[PDB]
Structures are given as C-alpha cells and as structure tokens.
Coordinates of C-alpha atoms and ligand atoms in Angstrom, one line a residue:
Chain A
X1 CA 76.3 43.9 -29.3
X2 CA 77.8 47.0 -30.8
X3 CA 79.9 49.4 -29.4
X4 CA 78.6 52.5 -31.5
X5 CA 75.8 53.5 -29.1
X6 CA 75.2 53.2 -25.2
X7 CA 72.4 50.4 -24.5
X8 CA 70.5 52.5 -22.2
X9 CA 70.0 55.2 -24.3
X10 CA 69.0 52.6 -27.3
X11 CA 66.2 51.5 -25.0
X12 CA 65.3 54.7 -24.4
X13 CA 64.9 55.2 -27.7
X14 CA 62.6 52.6 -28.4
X15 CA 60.5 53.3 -24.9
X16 CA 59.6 56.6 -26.5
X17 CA 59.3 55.4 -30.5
X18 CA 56.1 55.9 -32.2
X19 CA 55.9 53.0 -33.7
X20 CA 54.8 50.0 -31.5
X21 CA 57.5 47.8 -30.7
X22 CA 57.9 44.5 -28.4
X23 CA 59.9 41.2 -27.9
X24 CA 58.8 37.8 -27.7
X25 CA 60.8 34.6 -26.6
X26 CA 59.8 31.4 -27.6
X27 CA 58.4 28.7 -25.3
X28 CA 57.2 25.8 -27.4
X29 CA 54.1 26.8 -29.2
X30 CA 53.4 30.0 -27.7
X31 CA 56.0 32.9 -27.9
X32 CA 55.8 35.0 -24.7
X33 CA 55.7 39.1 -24.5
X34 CA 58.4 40.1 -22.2
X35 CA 59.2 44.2 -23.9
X36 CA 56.5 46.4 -24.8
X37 CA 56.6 49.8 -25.4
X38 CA 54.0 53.1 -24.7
X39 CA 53.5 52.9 -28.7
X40 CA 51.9 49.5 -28.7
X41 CA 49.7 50.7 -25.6
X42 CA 48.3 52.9 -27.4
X43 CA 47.6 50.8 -30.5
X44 CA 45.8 48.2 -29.0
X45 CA 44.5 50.4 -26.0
X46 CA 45.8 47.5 -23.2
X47 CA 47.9 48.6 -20.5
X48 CA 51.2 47.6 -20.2
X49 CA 51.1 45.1 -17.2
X50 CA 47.0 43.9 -18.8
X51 CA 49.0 42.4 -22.6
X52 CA 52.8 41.3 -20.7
X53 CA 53.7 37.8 -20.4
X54 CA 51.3 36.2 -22.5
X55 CA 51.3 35.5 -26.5
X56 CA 49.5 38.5 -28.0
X57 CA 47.2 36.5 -29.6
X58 CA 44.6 37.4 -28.0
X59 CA 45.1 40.4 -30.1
X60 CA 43.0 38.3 -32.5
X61 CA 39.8 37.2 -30.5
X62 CA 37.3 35.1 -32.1
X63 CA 38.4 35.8 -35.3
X64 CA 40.9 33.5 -35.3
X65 CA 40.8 32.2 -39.2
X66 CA 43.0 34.4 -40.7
X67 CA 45.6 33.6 -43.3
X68 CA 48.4 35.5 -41.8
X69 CA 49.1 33.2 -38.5
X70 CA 50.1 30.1 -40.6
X71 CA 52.7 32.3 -42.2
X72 CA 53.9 33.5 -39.1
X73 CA 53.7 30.5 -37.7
X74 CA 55.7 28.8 -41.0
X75 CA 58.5 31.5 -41.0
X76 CA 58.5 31.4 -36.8
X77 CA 59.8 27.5 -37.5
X78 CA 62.0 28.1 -40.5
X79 CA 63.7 31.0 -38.3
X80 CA 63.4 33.3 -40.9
X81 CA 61.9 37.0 -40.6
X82 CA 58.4 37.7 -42.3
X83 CA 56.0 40.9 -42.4
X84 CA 52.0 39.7 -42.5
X85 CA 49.1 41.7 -41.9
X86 CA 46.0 40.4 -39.6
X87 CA 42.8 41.7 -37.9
X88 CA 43.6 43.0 -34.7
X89 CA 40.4 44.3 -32.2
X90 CA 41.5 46.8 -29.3
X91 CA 40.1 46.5 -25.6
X92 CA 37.8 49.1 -26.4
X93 CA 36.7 47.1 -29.7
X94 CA 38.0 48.6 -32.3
X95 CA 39.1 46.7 -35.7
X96 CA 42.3 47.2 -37.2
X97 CA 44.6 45.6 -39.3
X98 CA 48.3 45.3 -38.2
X99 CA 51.2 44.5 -40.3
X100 CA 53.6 42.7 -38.3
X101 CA 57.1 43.1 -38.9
X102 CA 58.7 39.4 -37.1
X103 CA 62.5 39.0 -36.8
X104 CA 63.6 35.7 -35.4
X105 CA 66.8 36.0 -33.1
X106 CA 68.8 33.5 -31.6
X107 CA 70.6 34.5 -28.8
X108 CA 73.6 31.5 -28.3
X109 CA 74.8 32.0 -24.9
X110 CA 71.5 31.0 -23.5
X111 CA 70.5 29.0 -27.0
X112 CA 66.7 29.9 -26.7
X113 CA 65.6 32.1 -29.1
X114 CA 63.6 35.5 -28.9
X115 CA 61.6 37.3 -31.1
X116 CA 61.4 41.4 -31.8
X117 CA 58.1 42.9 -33.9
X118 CA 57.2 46.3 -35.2
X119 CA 53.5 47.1 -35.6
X120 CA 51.9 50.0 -37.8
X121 CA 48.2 50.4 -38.0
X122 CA 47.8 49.9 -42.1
X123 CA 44.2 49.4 -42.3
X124 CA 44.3 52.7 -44.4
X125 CA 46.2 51.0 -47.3
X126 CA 44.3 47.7 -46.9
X127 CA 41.1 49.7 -47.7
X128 CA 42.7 51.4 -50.9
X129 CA 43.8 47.9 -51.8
X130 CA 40.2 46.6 -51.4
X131 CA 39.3 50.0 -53.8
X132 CA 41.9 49.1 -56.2
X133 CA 40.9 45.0 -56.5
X134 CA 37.1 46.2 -57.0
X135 CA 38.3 49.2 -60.0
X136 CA 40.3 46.3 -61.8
X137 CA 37.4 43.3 -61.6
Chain B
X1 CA 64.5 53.7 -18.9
X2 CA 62.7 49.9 -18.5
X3 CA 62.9 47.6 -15.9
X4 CA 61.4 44.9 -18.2
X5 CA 64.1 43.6 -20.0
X6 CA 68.1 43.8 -20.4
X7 CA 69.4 46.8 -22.4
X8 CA 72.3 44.6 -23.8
X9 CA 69.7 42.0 -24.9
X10 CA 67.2 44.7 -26.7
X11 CA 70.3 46.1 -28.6
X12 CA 71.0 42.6 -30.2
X13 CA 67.4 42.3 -30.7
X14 CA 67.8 45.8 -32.6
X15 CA 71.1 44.8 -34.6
X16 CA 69.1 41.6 -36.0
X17 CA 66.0 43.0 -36.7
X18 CA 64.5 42.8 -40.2
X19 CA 63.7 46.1 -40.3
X20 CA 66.2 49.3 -40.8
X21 CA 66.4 51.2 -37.7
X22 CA 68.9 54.0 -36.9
X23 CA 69.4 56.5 -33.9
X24 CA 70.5 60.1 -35.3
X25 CA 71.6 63.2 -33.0
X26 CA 70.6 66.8 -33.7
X27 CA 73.3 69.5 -34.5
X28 CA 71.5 72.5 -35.3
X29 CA 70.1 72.2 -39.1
X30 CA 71.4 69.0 -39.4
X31 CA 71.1 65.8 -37.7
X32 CA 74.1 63.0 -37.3
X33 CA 73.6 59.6 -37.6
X34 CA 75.3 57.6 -34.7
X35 CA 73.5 54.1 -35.0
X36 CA 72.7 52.0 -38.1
X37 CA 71.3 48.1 -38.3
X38 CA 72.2 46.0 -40.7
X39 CA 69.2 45.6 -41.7
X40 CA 69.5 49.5 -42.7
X41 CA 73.2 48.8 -45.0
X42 CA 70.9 46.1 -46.9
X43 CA 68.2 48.8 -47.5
X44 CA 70.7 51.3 -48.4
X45 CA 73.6 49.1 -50.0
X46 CA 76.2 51.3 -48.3
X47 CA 78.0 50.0 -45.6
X48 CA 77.8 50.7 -41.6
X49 CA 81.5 53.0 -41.6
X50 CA 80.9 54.9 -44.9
X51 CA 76.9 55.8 -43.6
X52 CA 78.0 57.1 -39.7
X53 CA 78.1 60.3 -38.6
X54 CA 76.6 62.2 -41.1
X55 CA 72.8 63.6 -42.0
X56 CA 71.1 60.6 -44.3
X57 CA 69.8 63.5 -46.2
X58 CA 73.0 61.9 -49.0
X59 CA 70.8 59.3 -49.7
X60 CA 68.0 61.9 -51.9
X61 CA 70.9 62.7 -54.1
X62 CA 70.5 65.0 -57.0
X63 CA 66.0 64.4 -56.1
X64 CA 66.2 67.4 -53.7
X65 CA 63.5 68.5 -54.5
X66 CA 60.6 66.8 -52.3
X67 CA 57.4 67.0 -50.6
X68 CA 59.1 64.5 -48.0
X69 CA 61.9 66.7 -47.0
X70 CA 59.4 69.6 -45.5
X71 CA 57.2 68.0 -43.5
X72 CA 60.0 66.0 -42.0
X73 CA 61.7 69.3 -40.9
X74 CA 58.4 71.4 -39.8
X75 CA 58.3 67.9 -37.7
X76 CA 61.4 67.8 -36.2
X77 CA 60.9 71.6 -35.2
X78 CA 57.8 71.0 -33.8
X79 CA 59.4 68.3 -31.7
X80 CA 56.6 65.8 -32.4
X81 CA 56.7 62.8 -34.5
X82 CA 56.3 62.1 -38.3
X83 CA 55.8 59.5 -41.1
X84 CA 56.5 60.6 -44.3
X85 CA 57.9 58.7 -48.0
X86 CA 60.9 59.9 -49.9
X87 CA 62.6 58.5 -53.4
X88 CA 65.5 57.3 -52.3
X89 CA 68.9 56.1 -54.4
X90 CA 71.2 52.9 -53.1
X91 CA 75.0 52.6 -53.6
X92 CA 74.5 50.7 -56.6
X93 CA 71.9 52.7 -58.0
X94 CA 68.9 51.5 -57.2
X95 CA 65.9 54.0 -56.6
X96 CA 62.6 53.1 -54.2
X97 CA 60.5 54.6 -52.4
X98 CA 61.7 54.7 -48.1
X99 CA 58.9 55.5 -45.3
X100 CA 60.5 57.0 -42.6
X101 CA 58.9 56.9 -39.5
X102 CA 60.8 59.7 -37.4
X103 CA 60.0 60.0 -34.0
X104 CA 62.2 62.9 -31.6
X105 CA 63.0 62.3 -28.4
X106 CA 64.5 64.8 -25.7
X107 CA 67.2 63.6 -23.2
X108 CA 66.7 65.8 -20.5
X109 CA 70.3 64.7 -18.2
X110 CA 71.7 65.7 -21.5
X111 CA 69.6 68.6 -22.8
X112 CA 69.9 67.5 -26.3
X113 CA 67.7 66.1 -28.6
X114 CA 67.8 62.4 -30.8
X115 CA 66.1 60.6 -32.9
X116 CA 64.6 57.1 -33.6
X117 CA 63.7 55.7 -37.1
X118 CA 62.5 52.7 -38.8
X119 CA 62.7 52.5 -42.8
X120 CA 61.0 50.2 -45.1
X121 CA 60.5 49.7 -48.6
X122 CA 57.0 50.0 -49.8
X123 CA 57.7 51.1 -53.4
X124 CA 55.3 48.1 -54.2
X125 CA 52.1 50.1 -52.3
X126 CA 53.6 53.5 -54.3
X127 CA 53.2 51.7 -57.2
X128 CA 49.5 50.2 -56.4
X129 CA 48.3 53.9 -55.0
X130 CA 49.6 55.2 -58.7
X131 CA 47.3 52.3 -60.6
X132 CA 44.8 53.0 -58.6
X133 CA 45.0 57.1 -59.0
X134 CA 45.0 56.1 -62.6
X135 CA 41.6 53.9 -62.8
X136 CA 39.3 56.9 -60.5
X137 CA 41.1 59.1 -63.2
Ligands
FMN1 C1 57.3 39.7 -31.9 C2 55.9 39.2 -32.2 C3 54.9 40.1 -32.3 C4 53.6 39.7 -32.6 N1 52.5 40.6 -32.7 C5 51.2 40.1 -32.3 C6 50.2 41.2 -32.7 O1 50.5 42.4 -32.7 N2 49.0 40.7 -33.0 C7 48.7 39.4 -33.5 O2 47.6 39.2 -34.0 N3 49.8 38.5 -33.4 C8 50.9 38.8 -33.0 N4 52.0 37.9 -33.1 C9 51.7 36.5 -33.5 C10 51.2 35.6 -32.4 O3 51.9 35.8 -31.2 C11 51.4 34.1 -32.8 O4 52.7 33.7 -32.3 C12 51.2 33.8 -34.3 O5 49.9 34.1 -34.6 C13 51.6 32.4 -34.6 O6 51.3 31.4 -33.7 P1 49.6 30.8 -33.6 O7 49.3 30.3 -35.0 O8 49.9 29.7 -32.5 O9 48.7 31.9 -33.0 C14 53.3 38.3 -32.8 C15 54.3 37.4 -32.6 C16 55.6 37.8 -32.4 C17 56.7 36.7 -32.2
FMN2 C1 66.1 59.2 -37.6 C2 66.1 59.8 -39.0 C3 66.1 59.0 -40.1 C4 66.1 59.5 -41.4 N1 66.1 58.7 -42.5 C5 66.8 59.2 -43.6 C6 66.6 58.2 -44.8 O1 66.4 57.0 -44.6 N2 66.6 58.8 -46.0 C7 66.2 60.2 -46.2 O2 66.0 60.5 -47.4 N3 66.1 61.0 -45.2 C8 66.3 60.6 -43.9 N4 66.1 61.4 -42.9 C9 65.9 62.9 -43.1 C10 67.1 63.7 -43.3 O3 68.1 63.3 -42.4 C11 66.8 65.2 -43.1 O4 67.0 65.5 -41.7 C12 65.4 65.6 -43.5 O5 65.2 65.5 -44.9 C13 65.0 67.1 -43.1 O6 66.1 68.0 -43.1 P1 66.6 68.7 -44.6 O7 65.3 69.4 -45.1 O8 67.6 69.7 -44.0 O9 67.2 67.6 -45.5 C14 66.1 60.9 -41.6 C15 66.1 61.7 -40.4 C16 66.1 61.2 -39.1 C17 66.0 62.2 -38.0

C-alpha cells in the first residue's frame, strides 16, 4: 500500500480524526458501512454498532428527494469521486447538512470495490449561501 | 486500534482518496511530515519525495503573515483540534485558499505526539463569503 507509514498507526489516526470518516463496499444497489469512526458518532449522534453494516441512508429519513443522491448515485456507477451536500437528521433529530466527500476504490485482488467518505457539518456555509442568493435577487 | 476492518485495506482506502490527507509528527516547534496522499501532490503540485519530512509550513511562502498560522499553533499546544484556512502557493504558482482540518493525537506506547489532516480547496466559498461581505457592506 505504501511503505512510508505503519498501517496501524494510520488507523489510529483516523480512529481519533475529527472529521468523520467511514468506508463502504459495494453490494449491488446498496453500499454497505463496514469503518466508522468516533467523529461520525458524534455527528449523527448513532452509536457505533446502531449505523454499521447497513447503507447510511437512513441518514436521510423521509426526506428522501434531494438532488444530491442522483449525483452520488451517477458518479458511484461511473467510478469516479464526487463531493455533494444533503440533509442529514441525527437520532436525536437534529437537521444538518453534510457534504460528502465519496472516493470510489477498486481493490483488484478481491475485484469488488469499496468506498471511503469524509463528512463535515457545512450547514453554516449553506445558510450564508442562502444569504448571499437572497442579497443578489 | 479497530477490530472492524484491515489496516492494510484502510491505508489503500487512504492513498486513493479524493481528498488530501497527510500524517505529520511533532519535533518541538516544528512538525514533520511523514505521510502524504496523492490526492495531497495534486492539491499541492509538488511531488510525494520533494514534500516528506519536512513542516508544510513551505507551502505559505513569502504570505507569512496570517491569521491561520496562530490559531493553528495555540491549537496544537493546547492539544485539541482545529480547522482553520490559509492562502496557499502550488509548485507552479498557483495560489488558493486550503482548510486544514488538524486534529492531534497522542501515542501513549510512544509518548510522542502526531498529527492527522485533511485539505481541501474551497477558494470558491472564500470567494462567495467576500461577495457577500461586499453586498451587507
Ligand atoms: C462512503 C460513503 C459515505 C456516505 N455517506 C452517507 C451520509 O453521510 N449520509 C447520506 O445521506 N448518504 C450517505 N451516503 C450515500 C448513500 O449511502 C447512498 O449510497 C447514496 O445516496 C446513493 O444511493 P441511493 O440513491 O440508492 O440512496 C454515503 C455513501 C458512501 C459510499
Ligand atoms: C497535519 C498538519 C497539516 C498541515 N497542513 C499544512 C498545509 O496544508 N499548509 C499550510 O499552510 N500549513 C500546514 N500545516 C501547518 C504548518 O505545518 C505549521 O505547523 C502551522 O502553521 C503552525 O506552526 P508555525 O506557526 O510554526 O508555522 C499543517 C500542520 C499539520 C500538523
């Protein structure tokens, strides 16, 4: 993979990063959570063992008609990377918006392919650019 | 560190990500890069051997003089985490705006300190929070 650092202290490093991250691998449809880390706990408030092994999805409740899932679903086929932003709501209920950084990888030797994502809570710049479409109209 | 998932396979996750992401080790008032992405060379333009070992501090050049740089160190003192902007300058050139998100971590077997970061270009929202400074003006 690359011989400049030792694994286990990579993952290490990303257990204690504060910016949410997790891995994915595809099956069909759905793309499975197998990696999260105690960043992404505490920005959607689910435990660790409550949001594994199922497509975080349910991240987006009933508000499932947003814009950003047929892009991620479009660049998820193409295998190319993409960075969208959706509504998330955490288990306590609170609404966010999360830009999702997606970064398709195809791991040969066992020719499925997995998925890594880093999550930041942006819904302060989606309110100044909400601010900044009203000043212009 | 994480039963969840191999270390190996969360490395190559980490080399393919979209996303910049480097590891740095502290030595007193600096602190030494020992793991760059590729995803990090095609932020910075400079490539993975002339970047290692070395504080990325070179990449503020002759625009020493920042807001960025501070709050970054009274951070990294405090031992607690940080994400801050800074005007930064590629190998060809290039300036943008890079949000670091900084994020220190203590290996106790070890009793020394790293760090974890994740870089991105959002010169575009810079640009968007100067129009809209401009209009409330
Ligand atoms: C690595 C990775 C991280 C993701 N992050 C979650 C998330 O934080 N919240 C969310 O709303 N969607 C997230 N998604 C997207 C959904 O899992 C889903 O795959 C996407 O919306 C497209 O498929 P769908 O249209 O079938 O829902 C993530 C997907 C991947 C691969
Ligand atoms: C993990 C990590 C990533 C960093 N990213 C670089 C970078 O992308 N560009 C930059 O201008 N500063 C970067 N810095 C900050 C500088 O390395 C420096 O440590 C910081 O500006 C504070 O120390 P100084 O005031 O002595 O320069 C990073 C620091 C760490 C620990």
């Amino acid at each position: 993979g690359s011989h400049m650092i030792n694994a286990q202290l990579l993952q290490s490093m990303v257990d204690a990063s504060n910016d949410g991250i997790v891995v994915a691998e595809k099956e069909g449809d759905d793309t499975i959570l197998i990696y999260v880390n105690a960043a992404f706990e505490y920005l959607t408030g689910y435990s660790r063992d409550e949001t594994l092994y199922q497509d975080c999805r349910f991240l987006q409740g009933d508000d499932r008609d947003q814009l950003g899932r047929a892009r991620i679903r479009k660049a998820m086929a193409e295998g190319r990377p993409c960075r969208e932003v959706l509504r998330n709501y955490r288990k306590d209920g609170s609404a966010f918006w999360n830009e999702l950084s997606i970064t398709p990888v195809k791991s040969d030797f066992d020719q499925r392919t997995y998925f890594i994502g880093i999550q930041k809570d942006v819904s302060r710049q989606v309110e100044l650019e909400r601010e900044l479409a009203e000043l212009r109209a």
